[PDB]
Amino acid sequence: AAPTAYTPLDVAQAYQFPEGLDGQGQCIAIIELGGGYDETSLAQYFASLGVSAPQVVSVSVDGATNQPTGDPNGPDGEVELDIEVAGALAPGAKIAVYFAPNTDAGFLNAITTAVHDPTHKPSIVSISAGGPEDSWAPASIAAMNRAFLDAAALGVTVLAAAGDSGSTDGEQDGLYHVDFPAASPYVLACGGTRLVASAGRIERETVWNDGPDGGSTGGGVSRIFPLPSWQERANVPPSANPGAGSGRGVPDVAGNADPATGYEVVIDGETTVIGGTSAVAPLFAALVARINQKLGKPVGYLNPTLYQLPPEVFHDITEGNNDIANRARIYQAGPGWDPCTGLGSPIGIRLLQALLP
Ligand SMILES: [Ca+2]
């Protein structure tokens, strides 16, 4: 009931991120289509958490640059949240922030620029929500999906927030929708939960759903991408939309996103609390950076592997739903993979152990 907040370190601790690793030698690319960040907030924040501040650099795509508007409730909130969560948890990694115009081509160009970047050479790319998959021009979906396929072939991991408006994803057309890029089978789709945790244990973790007013995690069944071969044993249900039909299930994993149990951050000089699935992609980008550091080689495309690992690697979320439109409870969490939280929240050290040869 009482709203709370965690520093990113608290959340990493709850998910048992592997100790002694900080992402040294890795580079995490973060895609942004607006706003900016200021060095003052970043320095104050990293100093406050006691971590050595990671190097953060901006990359201009199609003429766009780092331009904070100064409004803590504007786009700077998302930009600084992304950098602060990733940087606080993989402080040994270099962070490259790619700014592009807010257009389909700018978004595509930022991704490809990051993936093929010979100067920054990122091994991981973190992206926020981009909109209901069926609101996208088909040619844009194809181009974006190919960019993700290329990243997978190149050994670059791509993570994307699943959305903040539940199973309907902000549309009021009487249908359920999943968000893109999360829906691409080549992206690690990140859903959201409400986490109640302390240093040594998770007291409770449920689906993030604060109703129409407070938001809810995206999740569902794609109407564009077929059910991947590697996801056929996850028990993805048919789409809830009349006509049903199988399709790629969203999300793949999930982590704390509820603003009511949000992240303490500093935006435009102001200490405040922010949530949303935009926090989850960078959170897990940091985990992957630590794992890549230990393995000595990037894990790249992880989806097929994740779905074949033993379930002990994940914390299964079984309670809650992401319906903020009606009383049907579509979709609902339950034992095993579900369309609200996927495989659940990863247990960092067990995931690393499972990936060690
Ligand atoms: Ca579950």
Short mmCIF file of N, CA and C and ligand atoms in Angstrom, two decimals, residues 316-317 334 336 338, ligand 1:
data_model
loop_
_atom_site.label_atom_id
_atom_site.label_comp_id
_atom_site.label_asym_id
_atom_site.label_seq_id
_atom_site.Cartn_x
_atom_site.Cartn_y
_atom_site.Cartn_z
N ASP A 316 9.66 -17.80 -10.98
CA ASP A 316 8.37 -17.84 -11.65
C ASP A 316 7.32 -16.89 -11.02
N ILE A 317 6.79 -15.94 -11.79
CA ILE A 317 5.74 -15.06 -11.26
C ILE A 317 4.45 -15.80 -11.62
N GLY A 334 0.68 -17.26 -14.38
CA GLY A 334 0.40 -18.58 -13.84
C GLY A 334 1.69 -19.37 -13.82
N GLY A 336 4.86 -21.45 -14.83
CA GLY A 336 5.59 -21.52 -16.09
C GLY A 336 5.52 -20.22 -16.88
N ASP A 338 4.20 -17.18 -19.04
CA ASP A 338 2.88 -16.55 -19.21
C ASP A 338 3.03 -15.23 -20.00
CA CA B 1 4.72 -17.58 -14.67
#
